[PDB]
Amino acid sequence: LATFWYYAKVELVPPTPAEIPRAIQSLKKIVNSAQTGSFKQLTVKEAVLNGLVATEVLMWFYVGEIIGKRGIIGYDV
Amino acid sequence: VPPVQVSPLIKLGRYSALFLGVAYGATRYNYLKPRAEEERRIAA
Amino acid sequence: IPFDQMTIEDLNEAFPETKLDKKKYPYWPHQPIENL
Amino acid sequence: NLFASFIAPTILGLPAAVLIILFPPLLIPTSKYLINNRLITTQQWLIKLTSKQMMTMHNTKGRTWSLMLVSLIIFIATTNLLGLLPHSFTPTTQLSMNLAMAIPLWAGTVIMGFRSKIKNALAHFLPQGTPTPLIPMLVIIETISLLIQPMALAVRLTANITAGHLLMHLIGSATLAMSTINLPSTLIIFTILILLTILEIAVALIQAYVFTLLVSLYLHDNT
Amino acid sequence: MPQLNTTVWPTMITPMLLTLFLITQLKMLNTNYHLPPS
Amino acid sequence: PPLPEYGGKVRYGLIPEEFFQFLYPKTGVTGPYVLGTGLILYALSKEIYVISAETFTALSVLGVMVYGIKKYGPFVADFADKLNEQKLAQLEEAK
Amino acid sequence: EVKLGELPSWILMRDFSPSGIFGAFQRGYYRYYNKYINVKKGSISGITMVLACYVLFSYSFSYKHLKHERLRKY
Amino acid sequence: VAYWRQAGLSYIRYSQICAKAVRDALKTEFKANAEKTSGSNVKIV
Amino acid sequence: QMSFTFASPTQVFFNGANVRQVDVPTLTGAFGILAAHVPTLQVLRPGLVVVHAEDGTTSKYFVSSGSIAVNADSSVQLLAEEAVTLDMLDLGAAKANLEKAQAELVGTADEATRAEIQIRIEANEALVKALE
Amino acid sequence: LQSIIKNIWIPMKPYYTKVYQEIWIGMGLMGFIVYKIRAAD
Amino acid sequence: DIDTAAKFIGAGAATVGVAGSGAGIGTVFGSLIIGYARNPSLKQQLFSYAILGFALSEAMGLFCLMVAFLILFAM
Amino acid sequence: DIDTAAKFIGAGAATVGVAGSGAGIGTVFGSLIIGYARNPSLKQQLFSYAILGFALSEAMGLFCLMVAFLILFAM
Amino acid sequence: DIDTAAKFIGAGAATVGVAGSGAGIGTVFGSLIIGYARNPSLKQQLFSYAILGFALSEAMGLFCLMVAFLILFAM
Amino acid sequence: DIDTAAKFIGAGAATVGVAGSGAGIGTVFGSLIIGYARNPSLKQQLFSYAILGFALSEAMGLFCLMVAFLILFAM
Amino acid sequence: DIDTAAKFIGAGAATVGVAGSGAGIGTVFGSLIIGYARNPSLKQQLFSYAILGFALSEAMGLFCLMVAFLILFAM
Amino acid sequence: DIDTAAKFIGAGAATVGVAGSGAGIGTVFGSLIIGYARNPSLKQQLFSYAILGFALSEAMGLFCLMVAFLILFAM
Amino acid sequence: DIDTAAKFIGAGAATVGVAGSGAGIGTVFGSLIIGYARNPSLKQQLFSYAILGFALSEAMGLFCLMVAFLILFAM
Amino acid sequence: DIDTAAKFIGAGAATVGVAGSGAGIGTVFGSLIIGYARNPSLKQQLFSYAILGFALSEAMGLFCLMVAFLILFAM
Amino acid sequence: ARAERELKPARIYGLGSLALYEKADIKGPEDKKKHLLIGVSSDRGLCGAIHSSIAKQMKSEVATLTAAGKEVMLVGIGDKIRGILYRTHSDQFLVAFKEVGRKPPTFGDASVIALELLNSGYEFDEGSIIFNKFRSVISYKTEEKPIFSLNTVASADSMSIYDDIDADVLQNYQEYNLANIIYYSLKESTT
């Protein structure tokens, strides 16, 4: 009912213009791990966790796609 | 259950990919519409 | 042994009457249907 | 197009019908314990009730088939129920499987009735108090009846399950074509579909029980 | 009618015989009903 | 060996709490739910989950199953429990 | 076990033999059965999850016929 | 028309036979007392 | 609404009681009587009689013969010649008498005594089937 | 060949040898009928 | 061809004749209900007769089916 | 040819007439069930009549079958 | 010719009408069974009447048969 | 000609309608059996009624026959 | 012409529907027999109902006849 | 034209389906007669049910009639 | 075209099959009338069963209707 | 083509045969009503039999449906 | 003494038997000739005015019935009544009975009397039983109950509302009610 918004205000919110530095910091951490090849230390549990949040953001891209074409089931045309 | 603030990278990726999806959907809609109507007409 | 960790074989060991007569009724259910 | 639900399913080129046929028994676990979980409790109770309801009428020779018949009434039932799941392949919809279930059982029953009991076996081809001028015809009748029995079994199973599934599918298609038209009509057709699904659950159980009961009655007639 | 496609018939006959006569009956044989105690 | 007294804490009868508690640290509480909705939208959008008569037969059979559970779940559950307690009492009386 | 290991030689370390895969499947069956079914005061979810995975497996092989009833064309 | 009516019996006779059969099937704890309370002594003249 | 009166020459089991259903083994078949039942009068044959009280409990008797009458005012009168509760009987004596009567039947030859034998046979059969 | 014929063939012997014999004759008949069908197709 | 056409027509016509077996089996299994409700202590003997009746009734119906095949496949 | 065609059609039509025998045999046995449930002592006598009824009912149905063959084979 | 063809068709159609006589005999006897099971001492009238009923029921059916021949042979 | 052909077809079709009279006569002459077996002292009134019922039932069937002739001879 | 031809065919078909009225008469006048045999005092009260039933049953049958004429004469 | 022709044919065929409503009303009334003869004090409540049964039975028959018109006028 | 023509014909034919549901409902309620007249205290439970019977009987009839549409609209 | 045409015709004809199952279910679920109204303490054993009867009756009807598809799709 | 204890269930039972003829209101036929007259007494004397009352009622009823030309037959349950009535009424006599009074009456006695009354070849169109309805330890009253034949209950119009009724069930019920009313009279005349 209303608890959905109660949680959304925390986690379903556009990122504030003040927190992008920490995000690009996480990005530079991940690309550093990619450069050195140290992702092999990541045990497959956390690797699967990261893959799942990646599929999460990919689903976000796809819901953006379906809201951008004004159609839910494929392309209306 | 107490909520948890998602890491800023995940939120930025979320909303960025969302906006890119809106853009891609609009572009592909406008791109497919002409060829769509053209094939609909040429089928008859 | 409490009756919730007991095997049907352990029960037959504790009460030899509960055992099924595999000689008079060799085939499933090893007992006449009415007493089933 | 329409019978796409009765075509032998193949995934990656392999005949996945084998797994669909082997799966039903995987839902009947067993245990050597004396007091066990709820699933095995209810399932053992159901097997007990079914055995009591089916085997009681038989003599000491018929009851040897108990393990057979109960197993039968379980297998079919589970299969039929598993058939009602969406996009599922129901192997009882195939004439092949029903024939291979009906001809061996009925054939073995008539054969065991003919090996021993041969005098009464040939006598069952004529009722007791039949008058004389009608003796011949009522033999040709009973022969053809006995010869059609296994067919009748297999077809009564197939025809029923197939038609049930096809009809549920067609009413679903109607609901689909009614989605973009009158919404109260869509709700009415959907309620008809729900009632039909309940009827199909019932018909699944009933067809299992009836196949089993007919085989059991033939056995009783030859034991 | 796909039921009349007699090519895939053995694929239906064999696992049914393996299931109805061996597996299911073996699962039944493990379902034993002991006699009630005194 | 005795049996544990409870199962695995499945949500909606489809997903266990293990998945939710595992996704909870990174994406919080609505994370798994937004994963599910993203997945279903991408499936019924990219024609992964085509819509046909099977969809409405599925809705009907799922509704029948959910109603049957919500109606006759307590009955079958406590009936199994009653069978077990009756067997247990009958056994203890024979001791 | 996996969810703990991060080595690719684990993949070759496993027994990819008929007995090996048979034992792996039996171990999975018993783990599921003992976590969800083989408990007193059990639930129906322990069966509904199997039925859900079964519906998924069915839709899998039904996709080859269901992709011909597509609403769109792209 | 039951069979015994065709034979020439009467429901009094049927009832007597049935009551006697139910009294005989009584356990000996009750049989003597039940036979006492339902015995006949009248004599036709 | 139903006023029930179950009686025997020496015992009154019910008297104007208010039960919900009474099953009787009429000579023309068995049937159950509830309130407002169609008025009828019948004669009994050896068999059980189950009386259902409003509380849901069932009292099972055995009647050898007698009469049943359900009336326009939902008043039932069931008069049995020998009404015994089920626990006062035994199975062995019933089976033995059944065998004796069958033997006398296969031995007898006259019509009236054969009918008497058959009546006793029916009484004992109803007995053994009612007991267990 | 161990725990197979120990768990699959030991319990099923009294049924596979004496009870289901006519069932096996019927299975032969059914296989013959199915072969005669698949032949003339 | 008109031959196969009339074969289909006659097959459907001969198939019509199963309504008799339908109504017949229903009677045997309805009168069985009534008869059991009247004298339940004959449940076994009644159920026997029931089968017999059914075994004949549907039999006649199955005859029609043969003619159908006798027209559709044997000709 | 139209001749064989109408032969098939008339054969199916004449075959329709077995529904009467189906419904007939059914009633003869349904009523046998009821009558036995009433007066089981006459079981033997009742069964006799039953057969007689059946022996006539299906007979009429069989008649139709002859016409079928009379159209399909004899012509 | 189309004439003989439709003669065959109409003959089969008129033959269909025997199902009524079949079902008729069914009740004529079924009810005879029941009535005898009720009042066996009256078997005389119960049977006489039976024949009468049968003698009329099948009669109607026979009528159809005539039309069949009236179409198949008389025309 | 197609006219005479369809005349034959419609004649057979209209002839089908006698099954109703067959079954009708059957029920009446059956229920007459039962009713007489119940109250034989009432045989007079019952048999009268019986005829009446029959006299109407078969009547309806006869109607169909007229249509048959109305198609076969009057047209 | 094919028009008059199919008119004849449809007329016969619509005429088939009188079997229902025929069987309706049998049941009503058969159940009237039984009911009078049970409670002859209400003889008159029942005969009234009987007519009513008949007056409706055959009515439905007559409806079919209209369609027949509606096809044969009105068209 | 063949279109109007088959329209007439299908109209007659769909009209055949009223026999079911005819027989349905017959049994419902027949059974009303019997039930009133058994418990005349329940005449009113029974008659109510009677209408209900009739109101459904003939209803089904009427359905067929619509199809007839649905073929004859709506097409 | 002959295709639409035979579609109409087969639609009418499949529509014929509703007579079974009509007669079915007649018995379901007729017997409901009788059973209530016997044991009126069980009116509610009987009415339940009645609906059940009806809910199945007409169901079968409805099936035919689908085939009709399955021939007339789906093809 | 005439082949598909007669396929439609034979399909409708074979579909006609469901009337038997319709009338069958009515008798089975009606006689169930009566039998329960007589001996309600046997409701369980009766209902069982009821299903059995139904499970066979409609079965025969379903058979016809197969032939329909056997003509309409399998050919 | 004890009879006052065994009367209550017997009274309930007999009145429940008769409750049908009371509810359906069977009036008996007033146009028929064959009449049966049962009188209930004992074999023992010193009862006081018991056998005298029974005999007076039987004599008055025999007189008033024969005055209308009805052929009456008499049945005496007890040696006292047979002795008192045998001299003046010997032609009009069918069956008598003995051994009543020494032992308390039981349903076996009533069944025997009903048997011998049915196996007598005398189809009585009507009948009546005369006993001593017990009111109090000081007061009794000679009462008389009717006994209808089969044709009376069958041909009664008010008997149409009764179900599953034919001549056979009515015959069996008539016989059983004859036995019941004889038992009721026997239990009332012993008080």
Q: Do Q13 and R17 touch (CB under 8 A)?
A: no
F34 close contact with A: CB closer than 8 A: yes
Q: How far apart are CA M12 and CA M71, in angstroms?
A: 10
Q: How far apart are CA P2 and CA P9, in angstroms?
A: 10
Query: Identity (one letter) of the amino acid at D117?
Result: K
Report in angstroms the alpha-carbon separations of S169 from I28, I68, K42, S148, S173.
9, 11, 22, 15, 6
Which residues 6+ apart lie within 8 Å of D136 measured at CB? none
| Polymer length in residues for chain I | 132
L53 close contact with N: CB closer than 8 A: no
| Domain boundaries of chain H, sorted by first residue | 1-45
E14 close contact with J: CB closer than 8 A: no
Q: Do I28 and L37 touch (CB under 8 A)?
A: no
Q: How far apart are CA I30 and CA I45, in angstroms?
A: 9
| Domain boundaries of chain R, sorted by first residue | 2-73
G5-33 burial string, b = 16+ CB within 10 Å, else e?
A: eeeeeeeeeeeeeeeeeeeeeeeeeeeee
Residue S96, phi then psi, degrees to nearest 5: -125, 175
Contact flag for C and D (3+ C-beta pairs < 8 Å): yes
**Coil/strand/helix, residue D135:** coil
A40 close contact with B: CB closer than 8 A: no
Q: Do C4 and F88 touch (CB under 8 A)?
A: yes
Contact E13, D100 (CB under 8 A): yes
User: Between Q55, Q56, Q66, which is nearest D170 by CB?
Assistant: Q66
Report in angstroms the alpha-carbon separations of S69 from S33, S60, S76.
7, 14, 22
- CA-based nearest residue to K57, from O67, R56, H26: R56
Q: Residues 2-41, chain Q: which have Cβ within 8 Å of K? A: 13, 20
Give D159-222 as a DSSP string.
HHHHHHHHHHHHHHHHHHHTTTS-HHHHHHHHHHHHHHHHHHHHHHHHHHHHHHHHHHHHHHHT
For the beta carbon of residue H32, count every other beta carbon within 10 angstroms: 10
Q: Residues 32-51, chain K: which have Cβ within 8 Å of D? A: 44, 51
List the beta bridge partners of residue S126.
Answer: S35, S148
Residue labelled with tokens 């105690």: E37
Q: Burial-class residue D29 by CB neighbours within 10 Å (0-12, 13-18, 19+).
A: middle
Kindly compute the dihedral angle of the four CA atoms of residues E4, E7, E11, E13, in this order, to the nearest 10 degrees.
50
Q: Which two tokens stand for residue S67?
A: 């005055």
User: Are both F24 and F14 inside the same structural domain?
Assistant: yes
By C-alpha distance, the chain R residue nearest E2 is R74
Helix (H) or strand (E) holding E2: none
User: Between O2, O12, O29, which is nearest N11 by CB?
Assistant: O12
Report in angstroms the alpha-carbon separations of N15 from H12, M65, M68, N18.
59, 10, 9, 6
Contact R17, K22 (CB under 8 A): yes
Chain S hits for I81, Cβ within 8 Å: 107, 111
Give S97-152 as a DSSP string.
EES-SSS---HHHHHHHHHHHHTTS---SEEEEEEEEE-SSS-EEEEEEEEE-HHH
Query: Identity (one letter) of the amino acid at I51?
Result: V
- Chains D, R: CB contacts within 8 A come to 29
Q: Which two tokens stand for residue M15?
A: 């033959």
S114 close contact with H: CB closer than 8 A: yes
Q: Do D128 and L47 touch (CB under 8 A)?
A: yes
Q: Give the range of the structural domain holding residue J18, as residue numbers without chain letter.
A: 9-39
Q: How far apart are CA G44 and CA D39, in angstroms?
A: 9
Give Q17-50 as a DSSP string.
TTHHHHHHHHHHHHHHHHHHHH-GGGHHHHHHHH
User: In the 3-class helix/strand/coil scheme, how is chain P assigned residue by residue?
Assistant: CHHHHHHHHHHHHHHHCCHHHHHHHHHHHHHHHHHHHHCHHHHHHHHHHHHHHHHHHHHHHHHHHHHHHHHHCCC
| Domain boundaries of chain B, sorted by first residue | 8-44
By C-alpha distance, the chain D residue nearest F5 is D37
Residue labelled with tokens 């009209």: P15
Residue D185, phi then psi, degrees to nearest 5: -65, -40
Report in angstroms the alpha-carbon separations of E12 from D4, D99, O9, P66, Q31.
17, 10, 48, 46, 45
Residue labelled with tokens 């008043």: I75
Q: How far apart are CA F41 and CA F60, in angstroms?
A: 21
The CATH class of M2-73 is: mainly alpha
Q: Do P20 and Q18 touch (CB under 8 A)?
A: yes
User: Between D100, D111, D112, which is nearest J30 by CB?
Assistant: D100
**Coil/strand/helix, residue S76:** strand
Q: Give the range of the structural domain holding residue F21, as residue numbers without chain letter.
A: 1-50
Smallest CA–CA distance, residue G27 to chain F, in Å, is 17
Residue S131, phi then psi, degrees to nearest 5: -135, -175
Q: How far apart are CA D95 and CA J37, in angstroms?
A: 13
Chain M hits for N7, Cβ within 8 Å: 6
For the beta carbon of residue H44, count every other beta carbon within 10 angstroms: 11
Query: Identity (one letter) of the amino acid at E11?
Result: T
Tell how strand I83-85 and strand I58-63 pair up: antiparallel
Strands of the sheet containing S35-40, edge to edge, are: H43-44, S95-98, S72-77, S35-40, S126-134, S140-148
Say what angle helices D137-177 and L43-72 make with each other, to 10 degrees.
Answer: 70
The answer as to whether J31 is a domain residue is: yes
By C-alpha distance, the chain A residue nearest G72 is A74
By C-alpha distance, the chain L residue nearest H3 is L41
Give chain A as a DSSP string.
--HHHHHHHHHSSPPPTTSHHHHHHHHHHHHHHHHHTGGGGS-HHHHHHHHHHHHHHHHHHHHHHHHHTT-SSS---
Q: At CA I87, angle to CA I86 and CA I92, rounded to 5? A: 90
Helix (H) or strand (E) holding J2: none
- Chains H, I: CB contacts within 8 A come to 86
Residue D124, phi then psi, degrees to nearest 5: -65, -20
Q: How far apart are CA N64 and CA F37, in angstroms?
A: 67
Residue labelled with tokens 């009827």: D199
**Coil/strand/helix, residue D96:** helix
Q: How far apart are CA F5 and CA D37, in angstroms?
A: 10
Q: Do J20 and E26 touch (CB under 8 A)?
A: no
D141 close contact with K: CB closer than 8 A: yes
Which residues 6+ apart lie within 8 Å of P19 measured at CB? N20, O16, O17, O18, O19, O20, O21, O23, O61, O64, Q19, Q22
List the beta bridge partners of residue S42.
Answer: none
Q: How far apart are CA A13 and CA A15, in angstroms?
A: 6
Query: Identity (one letter) of the amino acid at R16?
Result: V
C24 close contact with J: CB closer than 8 A: no
Q: Which of E8, E16, E21, E25 to mutate to test the interface with D (most CBs of D within 10 A)?
A: E16
Contact Q48, R36 (CB under 8 A): no
Residue K72, phi then psi, degrees to nearest 5: -85, -35
By C-alpha distance, the chain H residue nearest I96 is H25
Q: Do S12 and I42 touch (CB under 8 A)?
A: no
Chain C hits for D51, Cβ within 8 Å: 29, 33, 36
Q: Do E13 and D96 touch (CB under 8 A)?
A: yes
Residue labelled with tokens 């009721």: S184
User: Between D68, D104, D115, which is nearest J26 by CB?
Assistant: D104
User: In the 3-class helix/strand/coil scheme, how is D5-36 assigned residue by residue?
Assistant: CCCCCCECCECCHHHHHHCHHHHCCCCCECCC
Torsion S96-S99-S101-S103 (CA) sign: negative
Torsion J26-J30-J31-J35 (CA) sign: positive
Residue labelled with tokens 């027994």: G15
Q: Which two tokens stand for residue S144?
A: 């008389």
Contact O51, O24 (CB under 8 A): no
Chain B hits for F25, Cβ within 8 Å: 4
Helix (H) or strand (E) holding S7: helix S2-24
User: Between N34, N36, N56, which is nearest O25 by CB?
Assistant: N56
Residue F24, phi then psi, degrees to nearest 5: -60, -45
Q: How far apart are CA F11 and CA E27, in angstroms?
A: 31
**Coil/strand/helix, residue K72:** helix
List the beta bridge partners of residue I76.
Answer: I4, I70
Q: Where are the beta strands (DSSP E) in chain O?
A: none
| S25 Rama class: left (phi>0) / alpha (psi -120 to 50) / beta | left
The alpha carbons of chain A give a radius of gyration, in whole angstroms, of: 17
Give G12-55 as a DSSP string.
HHS--SHHHHHHHHHHHHHHHIIIIISSTT--SHHHHHHHHHHH
Report in angstroms the alpha-carbon separations of D47 from D40, K44, R8.
10, 23, 46
Q: Do R56 and K18 touch (CB under 8 A)?
A: no
Helix (H) or strand (E) holding F23: helix F17-27
